[PDB]
Enzyme design. Sequence first.
Site, PDB file in Angstrom:
ATOM      1  N   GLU A   1     -24.349  18.163 -41.672  1.00 23.84           N
ATOM      2  CA  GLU A   1     -23.525  19.315 -42.061  1.00 23.84           C
ATOM      3  C   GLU A   1     -22.203  18.816 -42.614  1.00 23.84           C
ATOM      4  O   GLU A   1     -21.138  19.151 -42.084  1.00 23.84           O
ATOM      5  CB  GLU A   1     -23.264  20.273 -40.860  1.00 23.84           C
ATOM      6  CG  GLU A   1     -24.526  20.996 -40.331  1.00 23.84           C
ATOM      7  CD  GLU A   1     -25.304  21.729 -41.430  1.00 23.84           C
ATOM      8  OE1 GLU A   1     -24.669  22.494 -42.175  1.00 23.84           O
ATOM      9  OE2 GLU A   1     -26.542  21.539 -41.552  1.00 23.84           O
TER      10      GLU A   1
ATOM     11  N   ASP B   1     -26.997  19.319 -45.682  1.00 26.64           N
ATOM     12  CA  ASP B   1     -27.696  19.001 -44.443  1.00 26.64           C
ATOM     13  C   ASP B   1     -27.303  17.638 -43.873  1.00 26.64           C
ATOM     14  O   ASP B   1     -27.098  17.501 -42.650  1.00 26.64           O
ATOM     15  CB  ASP B   1     -29.212  19.075 -44.616  1.00 26.64           C
ATOM     16  CG  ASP B   1     -29.732  20.512 -44.748  1.00 26.64           C
ATOM     17  OD1 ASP B   1     -29.252  21.417 -44.043  1.00 26.64           O
ATOM     18  OD2 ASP B   1     -30.684  20.737 -45.547  1.00 26.64           O
TER      19      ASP B   1
ATOM     20  N   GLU C   1     -35.452  21.617 -46.723  1.00 28.38           N
ATOM     21  CA  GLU C   1     -35.758  23.030 -46.923  1.00 28.38           C
ATOM     22  C   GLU C   1     -37.039  23.523 -46.278  1.00 28.38           C
ATOM     23  O   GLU C   1     -38.148  23.307 -46.811  1.00 28.38           O
ATOM     24  CB  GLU C   1     -35.806  23.362 -48.408  1.00 28.38           C
ATOM     25  CG  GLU C   1     -34.465  23.861 -48.995  1.00 28.38           C
ATOM     26  CD  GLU C   1     -33.971  25.166 -48.389  1.00 28.38           C
ATOM     27  OE1 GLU C   1     -34.783  25.878 -47.725  1.00 28.38           O
ATOM     28  OE2 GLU C   1     -32.752  25.469 -48.565  1.00 28.38           O
TER      29      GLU C   1
END
Lengths: 192, 194
Positions: B71, B86, B101
């Site tokens: 993050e 991510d 994803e």
Amino acid sequence: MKIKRIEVLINNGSVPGIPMILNEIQDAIKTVSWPEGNNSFVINPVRKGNGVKPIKNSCMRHLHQKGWALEHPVRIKAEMRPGPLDAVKMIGGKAFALEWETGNISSSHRAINKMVMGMLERVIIGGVLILPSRDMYNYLTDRVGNFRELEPYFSVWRQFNLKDAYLAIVEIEHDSVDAQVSLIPKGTDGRA
Amino acid sequence: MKIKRIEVLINNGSVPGIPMILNEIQDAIKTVSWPEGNNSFVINPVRKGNGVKPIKNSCMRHLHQKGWALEHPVRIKAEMRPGPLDAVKMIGGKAFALEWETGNISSSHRAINKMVMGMLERVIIGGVLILPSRDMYNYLTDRVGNFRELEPYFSVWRQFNLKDAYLAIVEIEHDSVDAQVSLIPKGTDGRAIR
DNA sequence: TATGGATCCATA
DNA sequence: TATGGATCCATA
Ligand SMILES: [Ca+2]
Ligand SMILES: [Ca+2]
Ligand SMILES: [Ca+2]
């Protein structure tokens, strides 16, 4: 419905009829009202309490009156199965597409991508996407695409060499609020 | 899980370290198992039968162990910014992005645009998007990421003029099917309850 | 079976 | 509190 702004992402070459269709689009947006039969868009100011599906209707009707095709199947490549665009005005060979947001913010990214694919593949001359202001968005279905949340990505669609293309985002908003008007129905209402 | 296919979309100038990064990413994906605790990813081939939430777990874990930041913010100059990536590795005073994803297929368009935004602003040197094959997708919650539905869009992504840039899509898949393994549990998101 | 939604869940 | 994610829907 109020238009707060319009962000023109791409505007190359000459489209025409352009202003004629941008005048149509705006007149069309202006007819959208709440409740049905009112002379402005009055929304019930409940956080996340208004569905987004039918909001477009009066706008899409007015465009049809002006010779737009509605829920118009399109297939940009061949390797895709067809999908619908809300309205389309055929200005000769290629398509001018309007969309009025009813999906997740993430789905807004795909709509502009598909518009730009249409333009690059020669099937679309222009594309317009209508998004709620953050303020209007706060009263709508959680996470519907909205203007502020997409704004940080606008540069992305500014990077293409497109001869004769128009790509714009329109920011809309309710005219006023009223806790006494009806909620715009959701698909989840009464079981559903 | 296995890597079915790597499809490079953008390859300009010089981005060092790609083969090493791609190996670490493969190793991460290999760790992903079902049932949890298994030494492969065995899936129940029930159409739309399987939730997705736990699938990322081991992958993101392996990446953090190997120095990936999770993050990680997209440090574009403007105050109006996309949210975090991510995972990000520094390779040579250079940030490399990974986007996992299993979100709705539409979420992959935001992920791509986010990594392109980072590359435009020269704050990201490249990225990879990992998402399932169509074959695996058939057994997951409806309308999640799948490579096949992205393909028509590769031509659009190939047009970005970026000096020094790398972007690639890694298609992943279960190892086998067994009509008797547990189903991956589903949450109550969206239209699950009503 | 395919696509573009509509919607609600999780959460530092 | 804002952003990313997940889960079925309606109709082609
Ligand atoms: Ca639409
Ligand atoms: Ca994320
Ligand atoms: Ca992700």
